[PDB]
RNA sequence: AAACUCCUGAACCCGGGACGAAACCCCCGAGGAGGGGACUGACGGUACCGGGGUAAUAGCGCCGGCCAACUCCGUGCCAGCAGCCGCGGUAAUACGGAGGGCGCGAGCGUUACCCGGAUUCACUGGGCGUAAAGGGCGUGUAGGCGGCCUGGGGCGUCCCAUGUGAAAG
RNA sequence: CAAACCGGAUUAGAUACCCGGGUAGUCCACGCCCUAAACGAUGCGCGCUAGGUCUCUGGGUCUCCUGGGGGCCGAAGCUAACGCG
RNA sequence: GGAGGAAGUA
């Protein structure tokens, strides 16, 4: 059990590093509804061939950096940018709460 | 060969050209501890007269209540007006734990053990009147087979 | 509401507030009286209730009601504090325990004595 | 937009019992028909049959009614006294075996679905398997 | 530790003959067979309707006073019955007659539990050959309740042992006069010991 | 209830006197296995045991409804009681006292706090016409939700086994 | 026409209702406040639950059928009721 | 019967 996780990337913008976004789905310990919770991980792409849109797997790996303790494992599918939007648009919804 | 228990005796008046005219109403529960119960509510211009009218009327709203080893067969919620009541039966060794009002209603049916709780408006006239209807909506293990079949 | 509105917003603890804010939360307290101006009760009454304003080690300056056949509490007199209100005293939140420090009890009494610092005679 | 249509059925039922009627047409999904299969396999209903109205597929429900009670309001003692949706789309119910709910200490029912199929309370506990509670009828 | 006060008031206050004195109890000078009304001034005066909370307190007091006991033990030995499996109302009447100060009374070594407790406490009764001077002794089955041979010769026991001779002991005990030993058989039921108590009320009491 | 007769005998007195303590050590024996022998107690002359022997502390709250338990006297919007209602404005079952009664008992009451009772933050378990509550309306992003049928993966989900879930609770 | 302002009159007095005048405003172009008894004091969307009845608007060989609306009594049901339907 | 659109003063 070195915690394999699967999630969509979010960035390809840093050297040998990407941003897997994985999703957890579970009930609510108080309400019977089954809700979503998501979390962002930073991963190790030494081949620099894991890029945006790539739906990959990650593993609880040895420490690589401060917030980088997981390795990329393998690929699931690459053609998934419509999810990156849902990250690209959400963080751009974050825009309109200011002066 | 019955048993009268008065829920409450209260006082109502009405303004009149020069004063107020009191009247009385009562809530007795006819009982027997055989399962046959009865509830009434009679209006009188004097106390020991409503008790008759209340005692009367109840000897008419007769209700056959089933008994399974000293309690209630199933679980029922019955709301009436803003007053609500929920009756979960109890294995013996429990005791009629209910409000001072419905206790009478259940006692005079032969119930020794039953779990209860008043809910919503705890006005007795609403709370009583509801309990009877709750007891009336009761069924037994036999009526289900007669309902869900018919040959 | 909706089940969805709930997980997102949720409920709030009612969080009721205290009626004895003598601080610390201690049940009793020591303080020195400062005022004794017997004031008049609320609407449906008219007596000369015996009152006193106390300043506790909590640092708060608050009135307090006095009970029984008179007393001996003067301007400078260390006292106690207690709990309980008075329907007729809009501003009296506490009470005075007697038989402790300078708040002496009540002479001549036999019914109810724990409440007035009265011992058992003969 | 008709979000939960399983409950639409259940809702169609009550408003057809509580007014006492013979037929009451309802759109048919194979999941819905399997429900009546396990509803009518008791006696709450006479039965159903795949039909077709206005060139479209529905489901006649031969609602079952108790006996004409006597006196004022001679409407018969209602069979399906109370049917209500449970696993709402706003809150879906998933339970195992060691928590399947009894219904009217037996005198009721609790219809659910699981991997071995749609089943009821006392039926599910037999298999030692549980699943998403769909409804309950007393 | 116990009541130590006026007893016949109890019997009058509850309107039931509480058999606590002893031989005077069945005599025609039982205060109830003399003054059968609640004591204290307003006895003969019209007693108004019993509040629905009243009659459930008094039966609770009946049993409380029948066995001579406080109200912590009463509660604590009631909590156990509520938790212990079985009907709450008569398991409680089981762990009660199991009390040592009771048994001796039931064995006729004394005509009064109040009388019996003293004999228990004073080093006179013996269980399984041991000097048990505890009233609150949950007597278990198959136990050897007997008057201590070191004190099986007093001018009290024999009189009250003889006083039983061939008495209808409780249908759950085994009395041997002159042998002075009485074995605890099974354990009681309300149907085995009929008392003026609707014990269910004590439940309905201790549930308010 | 008292006095009274009888009955036992908490305290008291004497005599015995512990369990907890069998090993480290020594011998035979190989410094093994095994076995044999012996010193050691603060608690404590305590517990307990044997015998003798005196009836020998009872207090607190309440008594209008909630809330079990009533009368007298003085007081006369004063003195006061009081958790909500409230009572006392002459004939008080509420104040002060007594007689008595109720509840507990080596304890009884006050105050403070936590949960409840409070379905009075409603997951079980609530509402928004007139009671506090529908945004002044529209459009619309994220999110929530979604008609019928067939096949796949089995993420949530369900079932069995195994590990863990320490001890005390 | 008319807030504010002045005068007349009623009045116990009239900083008002009644009257004689009368500025802002109400009108137009542009840009602001964005508030309400903004009320049907009833959020939007969909399905099911008897009818009778006037009317606005389409269609179909028509005191007939059907689709979209506004009113009016009322089935069951709901509410504390009024009442909704 | 319901519904819509003439008083001087404390
Ligand atoms: S039976 Fe005994 S305790 Fe009861 S009143 Fe008679 S003498 Fe007194
Ligand atoms: Mg997160
Ligand atoms: Mg309420
Ligand atoms: Mg009480
Ligand atoms: Mg006066
Ligand atoms: Mg809820
Ligand atoms: Mg109004
Ligand atoms: Mg807002
Ligand atoms: Mg384990
Ligand atoms: Mg101007
Ligand atoms: Mg501007
Ligand atoms: Mg229908």
Residue E3: closest CA among E67, E96, E76, E56: E67
Task: Assess C5–D contact: CB distance below 8 Å, yes or no.
Answer: no
Sign of torsion over alpha carbons B134, B135, B140, B144: negative
Is B95's CB within 8 Å of E207's CB? Answer: yes
DSSP of chain B: --EEEEEEEEEE--EETTEE--EEEEEEEEE-SSSEEEE---EESSHHHHHHHHHHHHTTS-EE---SSSS-SS-EEEEETTEEEEEEE--SSS-EE--HHHHHHHHTTT---EEEEEEE---HHHHHHHHHHHHHT---HHHHHHHT---
The CATH superfamily of C1-122 is Nucleic acid-binding proteins (2.40.50.140)
Half-sphere exposure of C12 (CA within 13 A, CB side): 4
How does DSSP assign A17-57, residue by residue?
EEEEEEEEEEE-SSSS-EEEEEEEEEEE-TTS---TT-EEE
B74 in contact with D, Cβ within 8 Å: yes
- Is B151 near chain D, with CB under 8 Å? no
For residues D120 and E82, give the distance between their C-alpha atoms in angstroms, rounded to a whole number: 35
D55: contact with A, CB 8 A cutoff: no
How far: B95 CA to F84 C1' (Å)? 31
**A to D contact (≥3 Cβ pairs closer than 8 Å):** yes
Structural method: X-ray
Pick from B75, B89, B148: CB nearest D44:
B148
**Spatial separation of the C-alpha atoms in residues B38 and B61, rounded to whole Å:** 5
Asked if A58 and A43 touch (Cβ cutoff 8 Å), the reply is yes
**Strand F closer than 7 Å to the CB of A4?**
no
E17 CB near ligand 1 (under 6 Å): yes
3-class DSSP state of D62: strand
For the record, the structure tokens of E54 come out as 């009243």
Q: Are A71 and A58 in contact (CB under 8 A)?
A: yes
CA distances from B12 to B25, B125, C55 (A): 8, 14, 52
- Pairwise CA distance, residues D39 & E117, whole Å: 67
Nearest alpha carbon to residue C67 among C112, C21, C5: C112
Q: How many angstroms separate the Cα of E174 from the Cα of each of C65, D122, E20?
A: 67, 51, 23
Ligand 1 within 6 A of E31 CB?
A: yes
3 state SS of E7:
coil
Residue B41 in tokens: 């509510």
CA-to-CA separations, C77 to C30, C53, C72, D117, in angstroms, rounded? 10, 11, 9, 83
CA dihedral angle for residue B123, residue B128, residue B130, residue B135, rounded to 10 degrees: 150
Cβ–ligand 1 distance for E138 under 6 Å, the answer no
Quote the number of domains for chain A: 1
Q: Which residues contact D30 (CB under 8 A, 6 or more apart)?
A: none
> How far apart (Å, rounded) are the C-alpha atoms in residues D127 and E91?
39
What are phi and psi for residue C6, nearest 5 degrees?
Answer: -80, -55
Question: Strand pairing partners for B115?
Answer: B88, B97
Indicate the burial class of E71 (C-beta count within 10 angstroms; 0-12, 13-18, 19 or more). Answer: exposed
With 0-12 / 13-18 / 19 or more C-beta atoms within 10 angstroms meaning exposed / middle / buried, residue C48 is: exposed
Q: Give E17's contacts (C-beta < 8 A, 6+ positions apart).
A: E11, E25, E30, E32, E33
Q: Of all helices (H) and strands (E), which one includes residue A60? A: strand A55-60
Write the residue in B92, B96, B100 that is nearest to E87 by C-beta: B92
CA-closest candidate to residue C18, choices C95, C79, C94: C94
Residue with tokens 């009447």: E93
Chain B residues within 8 A of E203 when measuring between CB atoms:
93-95
The reply to whether ligand 1 has any atom less than 6 angstroms from the CB of E57 is no
The answer to whether residues E127 and E139 touch, using CB atoms and an 8 Å cutoff, is: yes
Selected residue of D90, D92, D93 to mutate for chain C interface (largest C Cβ count, 10 A): D90
CA A19-A21-A26 angle, 5° bins: 160
Contact C78, C7 (CB under 8 A): no
Q: Does A62 touch chain D (CB under 8 A)?
A: no
User: Rounded to a whole number, what is the distance in Å from the CA of B121 to chain D's nearest CA?
Assistant: 24
The CATH architecture of the domain made up of E1-96+194-208 is Orthogonal Bundle (1.10)
B27 in Cβ contact with B1 (< 8 Å): no
Check B74 against D107: CB less than 8 A apart.
yes
- Token readout for B139 is 């069924």
Element (H, E) at D85: strand D83-85
Element (H, E) at E144: strand E144-147
| Residue E52 neighbours by CB under 8 Å, 6+ apart | B100, B103
CB D26 within 8 A of CB D8: yes
Q: C93, C20 in Cβ contact below 8 A? A: yes
Strands B114-120 and B96-97: parallel
Mention every residue, 6+ apart, whose C-beta is less than 8 A from residue E55.
E201
Which positions ≥6 away from C112 have C-beta within 8 Å?
none
> What number of residues does chain C have?
122
Residues annotated in a binding site of E: 8, 11, 25, 30
- Alpha-carbon separation of residue D94 from A37, D7, D113, D115, E7 (angstroms): 19, 17, 10, 13, 64
Give the CA count within 13 Å in the CB-facing half-sphere of E46. 2
Strand F nucleotides, any atom under 7 Å from protein beta carbons: they are 1, 6-10, 49-51, 55, 58-63, 65-71, 77-89, 96-106, 108-113, 118-123, 126-128, 141-150, 155-160
Contact (Cβ atoms closer than 8 angstroms) between residue D51 and residue D25: yes
Structure tokens at B97: 């734990």
Rounded distance between C-alpha atoms, residue C68 and residue C115, angstroms: 9
Number of other residues whose CB lies within 10 A of the CB of residue D102: 14
The SS3 assignment for A13 reads: coil
Give me the resolution in angstroms, 1 decimal.
3.2
Stated in angstroms, how far is B82 CA from G76 C1'?
Answer: 21
Q: Which nucleotide is nearest to B126 (CA to C1')?
A: G80
Tell me if A71 sits within 8 A of D131, measured CB to CB: no
Q: Which residues of C touch D90 (CB under 8 A)?
A: 2-4
Whether CB of C84 is under 7 Å from strand F: the answer is: yes
Nearest one of C39, C103, C42, C28 to C67, comparing CA atoms? C103
Closest C-alpha to B124, from B2, B30, B3, B9: B9
Instruction: Answer for D108: CB within 7 Å of strand F.
Output: no
Give the count of beta carbons closer than 10 Å to the beta carbon of residue D49. 11
- Please answer whether residues B129 and B29 qualify as being in contact, where contact means their C-beta atoms are separated by less than 8 angstroms: no
The domain that holds A58 is classified in CATH as 2.40.50.140
Classify the C-alpha dihedral E103-E109-E115-E117 as positive or negative.
Answer: negative
Distances (CA, A) of B123 to B39, B51, B131, D52, D104: 15, 20, 12, 53, 28
Q: What is the DSSP letter of E140?
A: P
> For E192, which DSSP code?
G
CB E102 within 8 A of CB E67: yes
Estimate the share of chain D in helix, then strand, then coil, as percent rounded to the nearest 5: 25, 20, 55
- What is the DSSP annotation of chain C? --HHHHHHH---------S---STT-S---EEEEE---B---TT----B-EEEEEETT--EEEEE--SS-----SS-EE-------TT-TT---B---SBTTB---SS--SS-TTTT-----
Rounded to the nearest whole angstrom, what is the distance from the C-alpha of residue B98 to the centroid of ligand 3? 18
Q: Write down how long chain E is.
A: 208
Let me know: does A56 contact A7? Beta carbons within 8 Å: yes
Alpha carbon distance E164, E159 (integer Å): 9
A32-91 residues near strand F (Cβ < 7 Å): 32-34, 36, 86, 89-90
* Domains of chain B with bracketed CATH: 1-64 (3.30.160.20), 65-139 (3.30.230.10)
> What CATH architecture applies to the domain E97-193?
Roll (3.10)
The CA distance from E15 to E50, in Å, is 13
> Per residue in E15-45, is it b (16+ CB within 10 Å) or e — as a string?
ebbbbbbbeebeeeebbbeeeeebeeeeeee
Sequence-distant contacts of E148-156: CB under 8 A, at least 24 apart:
E148/E123, E148/E124, E151/E123, E151/E124, E152/E180, E154/E124, E156/E119
Rounded CA-CA distance A22/A36 in Å is: 11
Q: How far is B123 from chain D (nearest CA, A)?
A: 27
Q: Is D31 on the interface with A (CB under 8 A)?
A: no
**Residue B112 touches partner E, C-beta closer than 8 Å:** yes
Residue with the two structure tokens 């005075």: C96
Q: How far off is chain B from D1, nearest CA to CA, in Å?
A: 32
From residue B63, alpha-carbon distances to A66, B30, B151 in Å are 76, 10, 28
For testing the chain A interface, which of D86, D91, D93, D131 should be mutated: the one with the most A CBs within 10 Å? D91
Tell me which residue has its CA closest to atom 6 in ligand 1: E30
Report the greatest alpha carbon distance in chain C: 73
C-alpha atoms less than 13 angstroms from C-alpha of C118 in its C-beta half-sphere: 16
B83/B122 Cα distance (integer angstroms)? 6
Q: How far apart are the first and last CA of chain B?
A: 40
**CA-to-CA distance for B87 and B118, rounded, in angstroms?**
9
- The structural domains of chain D, ordered by start, are 3-80 (3.30.1370.30), 81-138 (3.30.1490.10)
Q: Is the CB of E20 under 6 A from ligand 1?
A: yes
Question: What is the rounded distance in angstroms from the CA atom of residue B132 to the CA atom of residue B61?
Answer: 9
User: Residue D29 CA to F104 C1' — how many Å?
Assistant: 70
CA distance B130 to E155: 67
The number of angstroms, rounded, from the C-alpha of D113 to the middle of its chain's C-alpha atoms is 12
In terms of Cα–Cα distance, which of E95, E118, E90, E89 is closest to E105?
E118
CA B110 to CA B96: how far, in whole Å? 10
Q: From the CB of residue B28, how many other CB atoms can be counted at a distance below 10 Å?
A: 28
* Crossing angle (nearest 10°) for helices E72-83 and E88-97: 130
Interface residue of A26, A31, A34, A37 to substitute, partner C, most C CBs within 10 Å = A31
**All structural domains of chain E with their residue ranges:** 1-96+194-208, 97-193
Q: Rounded to an integer, what distance in angstroms lies between the CA atom of residue B96 and that of residue A81?
A: 66
Chains meeting E at 3+ CB pairs closer than 8 A? B
């Amino acid at each position: 059990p070195k915690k394999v996780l699967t999630g969509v990337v979010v960035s390809d913008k840093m050297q040998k590093t990407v941003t897997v976004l994985v999703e957890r789905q579970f009930p609510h310990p108080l309400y019977g509804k089954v809700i979503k919770r998501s979390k962002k991980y930073l991963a190790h792409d030494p081949e620099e061939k894991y890029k945006l849109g790539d739906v990959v797997e990650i593993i609880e790996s040895r420490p690589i950096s401060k917030r980088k303790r997981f390795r990329v494992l393998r690929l699931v599918e690459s053609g998934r940018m419509d999810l990156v939007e849902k990250y690209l648009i959400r963080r751009q919804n974050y825009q309109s709460l200011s002066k | 060969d019955f048993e009268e228990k008065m829920i409450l005796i209260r006082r109502t008046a009405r303004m009149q050209a020069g004063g107020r005219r009191f009247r009385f109403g009562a809530l007795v529960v006819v009982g027997d501890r055989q399962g046959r119960v009865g509830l009434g509510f009679g209006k009188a211009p004097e106390v020991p007269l409503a008790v008759q009218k209340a005692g009367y009327y109840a000897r008419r709203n007769m209700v056959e209540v089933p008994l399974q080893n000293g309690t209630i067969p199933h679980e029922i919620e019955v709301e009436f007006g803003a007053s609500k009541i929920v009756l979960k039966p109890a294995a013996p060794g429990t005791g009629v734990i209910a409000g001072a009002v419905p206790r009478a209603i259940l006692e005079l049916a032969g119930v020794t053990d039953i779990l209860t709780k008043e809910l919503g408006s705890r006005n007795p006239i609403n709370i009583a009147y509801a309990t009877m209807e709750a007891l009336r909506q009761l069924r037994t293990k036999a009526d289900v087979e007669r309902l869900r079949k018919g040959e | 509401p909706t089940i969805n509105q709930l997980v997102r917003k949720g409920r709030e603890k009612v969080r009721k507030k205290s009626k004895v804010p003598a601080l610390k939360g201690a049940p009793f307290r020591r303080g020195v009286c400062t005022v004794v101006r017997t004031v008049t009760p609320k609407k449906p009454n008219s007596a000369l209730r015996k009152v006193a304003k106390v300043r506790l080690t909590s640092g708060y300056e608050v009135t307090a009601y006095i009970p029984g056949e008179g007393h001996n509490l003067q301007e400078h007199s260390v006292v106690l504090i207690r709990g309980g209100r008075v329907k007729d005293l809009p501003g009296v939140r506490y009470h005075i325990v007697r038989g402790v420090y300078d708040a002496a009890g009540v002479k001549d009494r036999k019914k109810s004595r724990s409440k007035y610092g009265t011992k058992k005679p003969k | 937009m008709l979000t939960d249509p399983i409950a639409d059925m259940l809702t169609r039922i009550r408003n057809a019992t509580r007014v006492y009627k013979e037929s009451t047409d309802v759109p048919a999904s194979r999941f819905k028909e399997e429900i009546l299969r396990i509803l009518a396999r008791e006696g709450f209903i006479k039965g159903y049959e795949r039909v077709d109205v206005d060139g479209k597929p529905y489901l006649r429900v031969y609602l079952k009614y108790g006996p004409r009670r006597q006196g004022p309001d001679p409407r018969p003692e209602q069979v399906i006294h109370h049917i209500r949706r449970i696993s709402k789309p706003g809150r879906r119910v998933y339970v195992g075996v060691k928590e399947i709910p009894r219904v009217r200490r037996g005198l009721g029912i609790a219809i659910l679905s699981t991997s071995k199929g749609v089943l009821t309370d006392r039926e599910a506990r037999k298999l030692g398997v549980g699943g998403e509670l769909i409804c309950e009828v007393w | 530790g116990r009541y130590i006060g006026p007893v016949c008031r109890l019997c009058r206050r509850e309107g039931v003959k509480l058999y606590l004195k002893g031989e005077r109890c069945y005599s025609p000078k039982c205060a109830m067979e003399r003054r059968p009304y609640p004591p204290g001034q307003h006895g003969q005066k019209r007693a108004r309707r019993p509040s629905d909370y009243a009659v459930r307190l008094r039966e609770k007091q009946k049993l409380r006073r029948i066995y001579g006991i406080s109200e912590r033990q009463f509660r604590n030995l009631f909590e156990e019955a509520s938790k212990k499996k079985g009907v709450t109302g008569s398991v409680f009447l089981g762990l009660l007659e199991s009390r040592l100060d009771n048994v001796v009374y039931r064995l006729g070594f004394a005509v009064s539990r109040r009388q019996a407790r003293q004999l228990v406490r004073h080093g006179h009764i013996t269980v399984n050959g041991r000097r048990v001077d505890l009233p609150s002794y949950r007597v278990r089955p198959g136990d050897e309740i007997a008057v201590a041979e070191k004190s099986r010769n007093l001018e009290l026991i024999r009189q009250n042992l003889e006083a039983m001779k061939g008495r209808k002991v409780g249908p759950w005990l085994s009395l041997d006069v002159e042998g002075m030993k009485g074995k605890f058989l099974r354990l009681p039921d309300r149907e085995d010991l009929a008392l003026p108590v609707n014990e269910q009320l004590v439940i309905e009491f201790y549930s308010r």
